[PDB]
Amino acid sequence: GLLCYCRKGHCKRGERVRGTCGIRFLYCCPRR
């Protein structure tokens, strides 16, 4: 739902990139 997480290098097979968290970190939001 309305909750996203920072991922290192890339998101998991389910989380879509929403933005950037920092150097080598991406803010990904799950597709559910």
Side-chain angles (χ1 to χ4, degrees):
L2 296 172
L3 184 61
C4 311
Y5 279 67
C6 291
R7 298 282 171 263
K8 314 176 65 178
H10 54 189
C11 322
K12 297 180 301 178
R13 276 66 178 70
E15 304 158 320
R16 281 305 184 76
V17 190
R18 185 269 172 287
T20 47
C21 283
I23 298 80
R24 290 185 70 71
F25 292 66
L26 303 175
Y27 201 44
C28 320
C29 309
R31 289 303 70 181
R32 198 53 53 77

